[model samples]
Target: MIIDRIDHLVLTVSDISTTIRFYEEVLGFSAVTFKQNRKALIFGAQKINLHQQEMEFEPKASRPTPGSADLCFITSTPINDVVSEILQAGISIVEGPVERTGATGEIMSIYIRDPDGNLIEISQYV
Candidate 1:
């Protein structure tokens, strides 16, 4: 297989509004309304199409569920700055500013949870 990169992914969330707020307010993702009033979160070149729990779009995961995803994002911002912004937003850090391996190389990452309890790993290359 020759996959280049991810274009988008689906996230089955408990509450779309709450999920939107957390990702927008804390992570700086832009929320967009698309076809059939569907909601999606966009950042950089990728996006996360959100499906409200049982109301997911067809042709989806057989057992789409909340809190089942572990997503990692690479940021150019310094880790310290990222932590500061997260704290300012009143979100608790699950772990980090610790060393970890990323898709490309070594990085420093911090972990936090979204409204649906999905693990979000924010990392900065070191």
Candidate 2:
């Protein structure tokens, strides 16, 4: 059998609170602390579990490090609106608002770095 969908992902961040605020304020994700007092950024059905830099869970990536994540999130809103939100959030667009091909189809995306310098690609399908 093949994978049905992603359940969650882990992100090693430099500062947990700063990272959480970035995702929450910039992307509309909600921050929640769960078992082990671990923090997660939740968006709809998707969640990103976060680990502080130099911290590790028993089951962790062999090379877990901050600034290593490059995530792409698709939105129903227009790219322009997304840009507006990004600007209002006081975040700079590293690059984009350009066209590119996604797994499913053509897409428009903008790039930004989170607090830990993780490259975040915000996209909208065309």
Predicted candidate 1 versus true structure: per-residue lDDT over 1-126, tens digit per residue: 999989999999989999999999999999999996899999999999999976888999988989999999999888899999999999999996899998888989999999989999999888
lDDT tens per residue, model 2, 1-100:
9998998999998889998888888898999989858899999788999999766666998899899999899998889999999998889999959998
lDDT of 1: 0.93
Tell me the TM-score of each prediction against the true structure.
0.96, 0.95
Query: What's model 2's lDDT at 58?
Result: 64
- Pick by TM-score: which candidate is best? 1
> What lDDT does the true structure give each of the candidates?
0.93, 0.90
Q: Which candidate leads the pack in lDDT?
A: 1
Report the Cα lDDT for residue 76, model 1: 84
Flag regions of model 1 displaced more than 4 Å. none
